[PDB]
PDB file of C-alpha atoms in Angstrom:
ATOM      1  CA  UNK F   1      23.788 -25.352  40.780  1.00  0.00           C
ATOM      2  CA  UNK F   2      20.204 -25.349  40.412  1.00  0.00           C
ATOM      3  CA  UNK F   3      18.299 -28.253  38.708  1.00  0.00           C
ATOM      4  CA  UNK F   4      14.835 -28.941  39.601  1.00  0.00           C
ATOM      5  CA  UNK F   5      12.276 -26.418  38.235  1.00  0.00           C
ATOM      6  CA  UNK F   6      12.511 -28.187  34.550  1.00  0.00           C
ATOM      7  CA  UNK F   7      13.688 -31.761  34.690  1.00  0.00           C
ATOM      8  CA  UNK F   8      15.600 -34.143  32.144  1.00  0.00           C
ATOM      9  CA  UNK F   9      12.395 -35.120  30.692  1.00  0.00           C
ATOM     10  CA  UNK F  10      11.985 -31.546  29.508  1.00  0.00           C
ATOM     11  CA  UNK F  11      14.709 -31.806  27.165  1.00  0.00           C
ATOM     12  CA  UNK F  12      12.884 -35.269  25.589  1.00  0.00           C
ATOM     13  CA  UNK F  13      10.249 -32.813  23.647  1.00  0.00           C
ATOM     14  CA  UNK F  14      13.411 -30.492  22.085  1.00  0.00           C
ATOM     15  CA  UNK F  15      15.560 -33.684  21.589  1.00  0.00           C
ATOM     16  CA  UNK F  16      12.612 -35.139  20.002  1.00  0.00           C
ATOM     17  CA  UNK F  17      11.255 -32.323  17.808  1.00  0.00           C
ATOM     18  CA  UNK F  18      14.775 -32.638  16.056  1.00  0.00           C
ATOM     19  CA  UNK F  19      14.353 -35.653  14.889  1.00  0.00           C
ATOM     20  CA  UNK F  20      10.542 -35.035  13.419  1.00  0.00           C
ATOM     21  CA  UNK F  21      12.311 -31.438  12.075  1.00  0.00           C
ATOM     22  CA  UNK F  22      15.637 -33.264  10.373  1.00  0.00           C
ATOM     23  CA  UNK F  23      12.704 -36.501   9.496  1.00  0.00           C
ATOM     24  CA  UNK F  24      11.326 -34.191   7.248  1.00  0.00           C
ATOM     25  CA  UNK F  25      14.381 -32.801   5.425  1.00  0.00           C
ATOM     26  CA  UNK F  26      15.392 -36.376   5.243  1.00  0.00           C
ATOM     27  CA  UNK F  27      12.756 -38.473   5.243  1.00  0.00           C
ATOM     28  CA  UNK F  28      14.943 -41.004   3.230  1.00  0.00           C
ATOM     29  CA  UNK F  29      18.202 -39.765   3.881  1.00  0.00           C
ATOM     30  CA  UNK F  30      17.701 -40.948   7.385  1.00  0.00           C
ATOM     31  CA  UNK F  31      18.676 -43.677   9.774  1.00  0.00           C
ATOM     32  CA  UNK F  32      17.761 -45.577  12.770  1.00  0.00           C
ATOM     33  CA  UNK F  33      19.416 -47.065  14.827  1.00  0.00           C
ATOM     34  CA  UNK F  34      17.198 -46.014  18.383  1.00  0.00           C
ATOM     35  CA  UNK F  35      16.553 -49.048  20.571  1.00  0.00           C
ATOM     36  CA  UNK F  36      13.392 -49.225  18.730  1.00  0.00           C
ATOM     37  CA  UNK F  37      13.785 -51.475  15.511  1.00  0.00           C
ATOM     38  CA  UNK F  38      12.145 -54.613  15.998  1.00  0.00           C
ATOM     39  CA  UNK F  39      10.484 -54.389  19.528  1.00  0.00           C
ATOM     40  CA  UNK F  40       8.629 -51.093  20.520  1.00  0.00           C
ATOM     41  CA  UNK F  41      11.085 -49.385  22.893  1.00  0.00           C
ATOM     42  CA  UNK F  42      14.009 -50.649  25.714  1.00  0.00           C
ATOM     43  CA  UNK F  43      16.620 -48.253  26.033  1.00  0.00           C
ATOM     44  CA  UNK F  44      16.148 -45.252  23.321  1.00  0.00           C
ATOM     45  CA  UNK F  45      18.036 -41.912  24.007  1.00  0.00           C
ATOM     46  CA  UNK F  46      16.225 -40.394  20.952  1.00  0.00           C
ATOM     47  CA  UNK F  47      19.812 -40.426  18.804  1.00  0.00           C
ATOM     48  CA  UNK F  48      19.939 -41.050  15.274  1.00  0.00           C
ATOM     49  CA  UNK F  49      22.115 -41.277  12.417  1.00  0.00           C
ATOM     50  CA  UNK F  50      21.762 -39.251   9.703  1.00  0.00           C
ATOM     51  CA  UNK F  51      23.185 -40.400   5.518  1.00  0.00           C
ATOM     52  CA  UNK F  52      25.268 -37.438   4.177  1.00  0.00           C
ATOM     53  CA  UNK F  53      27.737 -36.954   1.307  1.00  0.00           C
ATOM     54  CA  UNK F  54      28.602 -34.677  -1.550  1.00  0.00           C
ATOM     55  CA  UNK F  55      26.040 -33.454  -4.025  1.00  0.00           C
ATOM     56  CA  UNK F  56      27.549 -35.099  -7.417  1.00  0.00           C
ATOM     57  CA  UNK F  57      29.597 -38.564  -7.806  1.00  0.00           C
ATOM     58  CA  UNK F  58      32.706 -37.123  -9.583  1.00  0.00           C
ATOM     59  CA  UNK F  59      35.226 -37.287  -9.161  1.00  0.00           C
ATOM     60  CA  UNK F  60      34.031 -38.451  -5.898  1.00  0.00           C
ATOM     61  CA  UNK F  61      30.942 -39.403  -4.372  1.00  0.00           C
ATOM     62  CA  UNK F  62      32.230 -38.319  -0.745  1.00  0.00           C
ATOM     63  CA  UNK F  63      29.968 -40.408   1.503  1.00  0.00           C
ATOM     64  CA  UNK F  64      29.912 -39.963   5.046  1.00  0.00           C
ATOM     65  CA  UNK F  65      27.225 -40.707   7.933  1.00  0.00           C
ATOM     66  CA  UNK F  66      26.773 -38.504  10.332  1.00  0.00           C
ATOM     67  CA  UNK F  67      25.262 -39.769  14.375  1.00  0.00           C
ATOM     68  CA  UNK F  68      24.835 -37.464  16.695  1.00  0.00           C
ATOM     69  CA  UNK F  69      23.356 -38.263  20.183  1.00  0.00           C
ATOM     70  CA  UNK F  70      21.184 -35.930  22.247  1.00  0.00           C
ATOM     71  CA  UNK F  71      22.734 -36.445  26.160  1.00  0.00           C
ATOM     72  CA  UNK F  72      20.028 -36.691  29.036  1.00  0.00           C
ATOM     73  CA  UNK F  73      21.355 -33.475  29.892  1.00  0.00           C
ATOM     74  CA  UNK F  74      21.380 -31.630  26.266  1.00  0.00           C
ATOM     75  CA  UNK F  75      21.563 -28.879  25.564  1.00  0.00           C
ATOM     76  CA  UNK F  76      22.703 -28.580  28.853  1.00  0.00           C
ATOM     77  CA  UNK F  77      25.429 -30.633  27.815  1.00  0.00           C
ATOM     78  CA  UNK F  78      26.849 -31.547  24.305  1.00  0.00           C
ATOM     79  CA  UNK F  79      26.373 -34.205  22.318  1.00  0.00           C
ATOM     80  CA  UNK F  80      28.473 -37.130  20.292  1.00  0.00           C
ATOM     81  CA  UNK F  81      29.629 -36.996  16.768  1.00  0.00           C
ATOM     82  CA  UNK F  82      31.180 -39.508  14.567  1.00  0.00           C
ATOM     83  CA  UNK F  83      31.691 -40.192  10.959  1.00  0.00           C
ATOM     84  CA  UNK F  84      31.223 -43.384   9.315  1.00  0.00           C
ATOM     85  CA  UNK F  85      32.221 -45.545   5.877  1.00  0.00           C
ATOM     86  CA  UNK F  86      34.533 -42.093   4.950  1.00  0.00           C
ATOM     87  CA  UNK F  87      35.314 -42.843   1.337  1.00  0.00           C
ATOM     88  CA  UNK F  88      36.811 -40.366  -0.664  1.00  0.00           C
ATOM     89  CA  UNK F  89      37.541 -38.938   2.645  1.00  0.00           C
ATOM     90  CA  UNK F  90      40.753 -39.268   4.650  1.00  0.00           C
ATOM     91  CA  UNK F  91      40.718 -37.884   7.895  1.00  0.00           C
ATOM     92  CA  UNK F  92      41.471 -33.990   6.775  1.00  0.00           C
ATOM     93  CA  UNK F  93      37.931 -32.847   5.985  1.00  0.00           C
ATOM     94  CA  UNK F  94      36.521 -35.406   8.713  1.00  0.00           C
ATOM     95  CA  UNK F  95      38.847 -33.909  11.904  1.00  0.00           C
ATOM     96  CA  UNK F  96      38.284 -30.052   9.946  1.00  0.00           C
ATOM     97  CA  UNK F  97      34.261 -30.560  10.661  1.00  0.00           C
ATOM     98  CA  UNK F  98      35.085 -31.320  14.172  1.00  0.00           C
ATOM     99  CA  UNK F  99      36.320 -28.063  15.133  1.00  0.00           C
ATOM    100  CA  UNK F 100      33.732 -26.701  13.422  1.00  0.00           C
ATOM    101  CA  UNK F 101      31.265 -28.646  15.273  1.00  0.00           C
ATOM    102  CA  UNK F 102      32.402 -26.167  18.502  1.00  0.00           C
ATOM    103  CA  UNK F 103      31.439 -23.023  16.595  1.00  0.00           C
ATOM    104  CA  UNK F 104      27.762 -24.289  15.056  1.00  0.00           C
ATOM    105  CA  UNK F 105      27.217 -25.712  19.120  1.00  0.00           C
ATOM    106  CA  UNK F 106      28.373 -22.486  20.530  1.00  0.00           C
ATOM    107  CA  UNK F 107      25.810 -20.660  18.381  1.00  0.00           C
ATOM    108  CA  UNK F 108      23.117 -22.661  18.793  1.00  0.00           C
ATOM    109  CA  UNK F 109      23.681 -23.940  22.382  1.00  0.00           C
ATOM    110  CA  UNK F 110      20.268 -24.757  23.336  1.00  0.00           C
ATOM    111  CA  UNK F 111      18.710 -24.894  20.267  1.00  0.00           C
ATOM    112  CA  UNK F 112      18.803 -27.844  17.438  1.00  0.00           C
ATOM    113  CA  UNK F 113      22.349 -28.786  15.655  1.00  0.00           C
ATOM    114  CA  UNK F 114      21.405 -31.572  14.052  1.00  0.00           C
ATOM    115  CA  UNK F 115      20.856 -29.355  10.728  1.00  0.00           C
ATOM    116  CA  UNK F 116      23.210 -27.076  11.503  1.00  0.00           C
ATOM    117  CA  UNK F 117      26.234 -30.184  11.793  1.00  0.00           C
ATOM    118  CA  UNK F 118      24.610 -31.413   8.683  1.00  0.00           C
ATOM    119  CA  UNK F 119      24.527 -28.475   6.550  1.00  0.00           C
ATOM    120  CA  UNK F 120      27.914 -26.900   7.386  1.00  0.00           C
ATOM    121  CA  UNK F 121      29.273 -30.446   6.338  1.00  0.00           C
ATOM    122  CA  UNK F 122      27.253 -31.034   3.529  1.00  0.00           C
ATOM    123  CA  UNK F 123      28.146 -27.750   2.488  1.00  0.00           C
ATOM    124  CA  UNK F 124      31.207 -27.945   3.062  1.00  0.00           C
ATOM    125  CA  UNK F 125      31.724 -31.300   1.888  1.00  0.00           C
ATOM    126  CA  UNK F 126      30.019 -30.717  -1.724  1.00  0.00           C
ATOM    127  CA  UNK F 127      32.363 -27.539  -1.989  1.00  0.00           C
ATOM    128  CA  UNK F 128      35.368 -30.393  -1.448  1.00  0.00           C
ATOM    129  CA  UNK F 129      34.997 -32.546  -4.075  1.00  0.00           C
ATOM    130  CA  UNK F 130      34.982 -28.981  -6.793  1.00  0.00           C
ATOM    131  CA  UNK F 131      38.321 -28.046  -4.951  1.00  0.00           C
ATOM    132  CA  UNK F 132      40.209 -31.242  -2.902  1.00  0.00           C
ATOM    133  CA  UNK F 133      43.947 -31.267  -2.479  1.00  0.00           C
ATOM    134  CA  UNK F 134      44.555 -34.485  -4.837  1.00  0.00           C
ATOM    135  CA  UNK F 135      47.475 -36.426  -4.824  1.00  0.00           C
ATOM    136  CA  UNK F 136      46.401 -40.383  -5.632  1.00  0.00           C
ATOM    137  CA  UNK F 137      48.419 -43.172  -4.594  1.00  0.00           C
ATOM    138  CA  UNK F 138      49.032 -42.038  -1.151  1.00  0.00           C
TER     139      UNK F 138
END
C-alpha cells in the first residue's frame, strides 16, 4: 500500500543487529552458513543457523539446529524455519515448535525472534527429555 518512506535496506540494520545480539548468547553455539565463508561477500541475506539441543545427554542428548532466514521484506514479512540432524527427535516435538513459531512471531512481529524461536525450543526441548512419551523400537 505504501512503501517508500523506509526502504528494504532499513530492515538490513534490525536483521543484522540479531545476529550480533544472538552472536553474543552464542558465540560458539553458532553457525554460518551466509554467502560469506571463504570470499568476502556475493549473495548474503544476513541468515544464519543457530546449534540447539537439550541441556543434559540422558537419556537423550536431543540435538537439533535451528536456521532461520530474515526475508528482504522482514518483519514485514516472516521468515523460514527448519530443523536439522533431529536425533532423539521424531517429528512430534519438531512439527509442535512450528505452531508455536506463529505465537512467538505474532508477539514479536517486528521485533527479533531469533531468541525468542530459540528459547521457547530450547526450553521446551530440555523440559522433553525429563518427560518424553517413550516407547523404543518404533
Amino acid at each position: 500500500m505504501s512503501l517508500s518512506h523506509l526502504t528494504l535496506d532499513q530492515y538490513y540494520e534490525i536483521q543484522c543487529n540479531e545476529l550480533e545480539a544472538i552472536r553474543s548468547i552464542y558465540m560458539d553455539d553458532f553457525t554460518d552458513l551466509t554467502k560469506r565463508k571463504s570470499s568476502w561477500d556475493k549473495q548474503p541475506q544476513i541468515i544464519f543457523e543457530i546449534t540447539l539441543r537439550s541441556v543434559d545427554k540422558e537419556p537423550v542428548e536431543s540435538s537439533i539446529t535451528l536456521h532461520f532466514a530474515m526475508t528482504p521484506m522482514y518483519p514485514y514479512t516472516a521468515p523460514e524455519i527448519e530443523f536439522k540432524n533431529v536425533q532423539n527427535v521424531m517429528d512430534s516435538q519438531l512439527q509442535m515448535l512450528k505452531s508455536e513459531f506463529k505465537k512467538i512471531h505474532n508477539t514479536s512481529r517486528g521485533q527479533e525472534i531469533i531468541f525468542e524461536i530459540t528459547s521457547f525450543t530450547q526450553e521446551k526441548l530440555d523440559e522433553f527429555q525429563n518427560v518424553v512419551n517413550t516407547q523404543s523400537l518404533e
